[PDB]
Design an enzyme around this catalytic site. Structure first.
Site, PDB file in Angstrom:
ATOM      1  N   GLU A 235       0.809  -1.219   0.000  1.00 29.44           N
ATOM      2  CA  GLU A 235       0.000   0.000   0.000  1.00 29.44           C
ATOM      3  C   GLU A 235       0.843   1.270   0.000  1.00 29.44           C
ATOM      4  OE1 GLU A 235      -3.087  -0.720   2.993  1.00 29.44           O
ATOM      5  OE2 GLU A 235      -4.051  -2.084   1.579  1.00 29.44           O
ATOM      6  N   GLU A 340      -4.210  -9.177  -1.061  1.00 33.99           N
ATOM      7  CA  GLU A 340      -4.803  -8.919   0.240  1.00 33.99           C
ATOM      8  C   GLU A 340      -6.256  -8.490   0.087  1.00 33.99           C
ATOM      9  OE1 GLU A 340      -2.502  -6.431   3.222  1.00 33.99           O
ATOM     10  OE2 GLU A 340      -4.525  -5.684   3.687  1.00 33.99           O
ATOM     11  N   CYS A 342      -9.940  -8.130   2.937  1.00 31.67           N
ATOM     12  CA  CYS A 342     -10.556  -8.457   4.216  1.00 31.67           C
ATOM     13  C   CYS A 342     -11.892  -7.732   4.308  1.00 31.67           C
ATOM     14  CB  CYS A 342      -9.613  -8.114   5.370  1.00 31.67           C
ATOM     15  SG  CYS A 342      -9.396  -6.286   5.655  1.00 31.67           S
ATOM     16  N   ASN A 370     -12.623 -11.375  -9.566  1.00 31.71           N
ATOM     17  CA  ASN A 370     -11.200 -11.329  -9.861  1.00 31.71           C
ATOM     18  C   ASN A 370     -10.831 -12.312 -10.970  1.00 31.71           C
ATOM     19  OD1 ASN A 370     -10.713  -9.324  -8.007  1.00 31.71           O
ATOM     20  ND2 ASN A 370      -9.982 -10.568  -6.410  1.00 31.71           N
TER      21      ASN A 370
END
Ligand SMILES: O=C(CSCc1cc(C(F)(F)F)cc(C(F)(F)F)c1)Nc1ccc(Cl)cc1C(=O)O
Ligand SMILES: O=C(CSCc1cc(C(F)(F)F)cc(C(F)(F)F)c1)Nc1ccc(Cl)cc1C(=O)O
Ligand SMILES: *[C@@H]1O[C@H](CO)[C@@H](O)[C@H](O)[C@H]1NC(C)=O
EC number: 3.2.1.45
Length: 497
Positions: A235, A340, A342, A370
């Site tokens: 990030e 990643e 969540c 995806n």
């Protein structure tokens, strides 16, 4: 082998309860005879990857939904599925008694479980740590003389990684990502907040940081762990933001481009770890395709980049064609990989919602979206958390597919775990996505792939409350007639020859 022990916490579905002497599991993978199909089913009502088998029919009549396999329409090949060994996950797993640890690890990594083949490993501390540290905290140690792995690696993460690889039959790939550099490499002198590397790419701060990657890989290699890939930074856009609360290291896309071209690429390439892949971005897909254009149109950076890593916050639904799709179109030979994701940050919900069927569905809906836009792998965040969603030194709690209750020597497998497994157990590395066309508009998410050995796999998620009759046409074998219960998720497998 052993069924789910269900427990309700008052939400819409159940968790499966595991402890030192019991956890639900699979028998060894047993494959359907030609002319038949395998079905695994999970439902909000409580079914958990239940196996059934049925016949493939020679003919089909009706006006019902038909999904036609297009096996010669070939797309991306799959790298794999897994999750992150954060300090928090490792601390939670190891607080269980040893027999429970092994059932937790087998749930994820065994053929008796769901066959994870990716583990993401933070390079030193992140918010899902109980303290802040880097591997080189001695100020101004440009030679990295004091670079050292702490107990978080040597006593928590590494021993668990070894055991996960021992339990796995499939080769497991490790992915490493850093959150912050040492603070003395940074303009702001702190692990969090707005701050980037000091100076300019090519200079001592950037060379030192690139060497820190090599020292990390050196140290893990001394522990007999080898990496498949590293990301350029977790990030990077986070560290551009005033007050950002978590460990971070800011890069604009231009700064990443030039750090990769001048420092990180060349340093890795000239190391004994030159075969490790380098992924760029490792950030929210909203930054695409611009970030990808900036980095990849410079050939001196592009030659070092193997792939583009993306994050998503599953509490949100956002565009994918315009980000993943357009990026693949521009750079079709640079893989996209979800590193990643969540859920659990909505203020009006618990961070951990034990038994949440909605949260399972958000996992598989994300995974299917995806895969339909060229992504080769999908990586969950924390492999396990406590019932608060931690620990986390900034109290940024979220959910996780496995929740550990240390006081009870118990852990709970959430619907998310089974929604992940409907992909991870049945899509081995090297599987190729293929075409799958719908005869009419419908409320299903579906994706089709061919295993390396030629056999087929289709995952169907029913986003609606209604049962949906459907048929799947494979011209090699015939018709698979089935029903998709409302809210359910199914994986279908069958041989084609
Ligand atoms: O991310 C999003 C998704 S847009 C909302 C939306 C639209 C539709 C559509 F109209 F297209 F059918 C369907 C759905 C569904 F998921 F329920 F199916 C959701 N929005 C939020 C996310 C988090 C928070 Cl806390 C607030 C918002 C907010 O937008 O208020
Ligand atoms: O404005 C804010 C503060 S920024 C944090 C944030 C914003 C949003 C956004 F509003 F952008 F959708 C969603 C989420 C997420 F948790 F869903 F990921 C987190 N928060 C909300 C504002 C309105 C509502 Cl309904 C809920 C929240 C909320 O914090 O849950
Ligand atoms: C562990 O779970 C099994 C299955 O429900 C149960 O029979 C056993 O008593 C549990 N052990 C403990 C210590 O609670």
């Amino acid at each position: 082998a052993r069924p789910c022990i269900p427990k309700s916490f008052g939400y819409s579905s159940v968790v499966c309860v595991c402890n030192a002497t019991y956890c639900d599991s699979f028998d060894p993978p047993t494959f359907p005879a030609l002319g038949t199909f395998s079905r695994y089913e999970s439902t909000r009502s409580g079914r958990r990857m239940e196996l059934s088998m049925g016949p493939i029919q020679a003919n089909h009549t009706g006006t019902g939904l038909l999904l036609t396999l297009q096996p010669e329409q070939k797309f991306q090949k799959v790298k794999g599925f897994g999750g992150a060994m954060t300090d928090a996950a490792a601390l939670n797993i190891l607080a269980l008694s040893p027999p429970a640890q092994n059932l937790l690890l087998k749930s994820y990594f065994s053929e008796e479980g769901i066959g994870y083949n990716i583990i993401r490993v933070p390079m030193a501390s992140c918010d899902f740590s109980i303290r802040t540290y880097t591997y080189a905290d001695t100020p101004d140690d440009f030679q990295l003389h004091n670079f050292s792995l702490p107990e978080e690696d040597t006593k928590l993460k590494i021993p668990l990684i070894h055991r996960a690889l021992q339990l796995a039959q499939r080769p497991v790939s490790l992915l490493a990502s850093p959150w912050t550099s040492p603070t003395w490499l940074k303009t702001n002198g702190a692990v969090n907040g707005k701050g980037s590397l000091k100076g300019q790419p090519g200079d001592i701060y950037h060379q030192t940081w690139a060497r820190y990657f090599v020292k990390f890989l050196d140290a893990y290699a001394e522990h007999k762990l080898q990496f498949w890939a590293v990301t350029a930074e977790n990030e990077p856009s986070a560290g551009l933001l005033s007050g950002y609360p978590f460990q971070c290291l800011g890069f604009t896309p231009e700064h990443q481009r030039d750090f990769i071209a001048r420092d990180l690429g060349p340093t890795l390439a000239n190391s004994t770890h030159h075969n490790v892949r380098l992924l760029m971005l490792d950030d929210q897909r909203l930054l695409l395709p611009h970030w990808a254009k900036v980095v990849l149109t410079d050939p001196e950076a592009a030659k070092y980049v193997h792939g583009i890593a993306v994050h998503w916050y599953l509490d949100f639904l956002a565009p994918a064609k315009a980000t993943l799709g357009e990026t693949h179109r521009l750079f079709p030979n640079t893989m996209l990989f979800a590193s990643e994701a969540c859920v659990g940050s909505k203020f009006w919900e618990q961070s951990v919602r034990l038994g949440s069927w909605d949260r399972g569905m958000q996992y598989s809906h994300s995974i299917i979206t995806n895969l339909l836009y060229h992504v080769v792998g999908w990586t969950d965040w924390n492999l396990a958390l406590n019932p608060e969603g931690g620990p986390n030194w900034v109290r940024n709690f979220v959910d996780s597919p496995i929740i550990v209750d240390i006081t009870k020597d118990t852990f709970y497998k959430q619907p998310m775990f089974y929604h992940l497994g409907h992909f991870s157990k049945f899509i081995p590395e090297g599987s190729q996505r293929v075409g799958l066309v719908a005869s009419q508009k419908n409320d299903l998410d579906a994706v089709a792939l061919m295993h390396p050995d030629g056999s087929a796999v289709v995952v169907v998620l029913n986003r609606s409350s209604k049962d949906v009759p459907l048929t799947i046409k494979d011209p090699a074998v015939g018709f698979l007639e089935t029903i998709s219960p409302g809210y359910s998720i199914h994986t279908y497998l069958w041989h084609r020859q």
